[PDB]
Copies of this chain bind each other. A is one copy, B any other.
Amino acid sequence: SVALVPHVGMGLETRTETWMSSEGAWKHAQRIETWILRHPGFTIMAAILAYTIGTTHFQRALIFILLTAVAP
Please list the residues of chain A having a beta carbon within 8 angstroms of any beta carbon in chain B. Answer: 1, 3-6, 8-9, 27, 31, 35, 39, 53-55, 58-59, 62-63, 66-67, 69-70, 72
Known: A63-B63, A67-B66, A70-B69. A31 touches B55 (CB 8 A): no
Question: 12 other contacts beyond A54-B59, A62-B63, A63-B66, with CB at 8 A cut-off?
Answer: A1-B3, A3-B3, A4-B27, A4-B31, A5-B31, A6-B72, A8-B72, A9-B39, A53-B62, A55-B55, A66-B67, A69-B70
From residue A64, how far is it (CB to closest CB) to chain B in Å?
10
Q: A67 — which chain B residues lie within 8 A by C-beta?
A: 66
Give the residue name and chain of the B residue nearest to A31 (CB).
Answer: B4
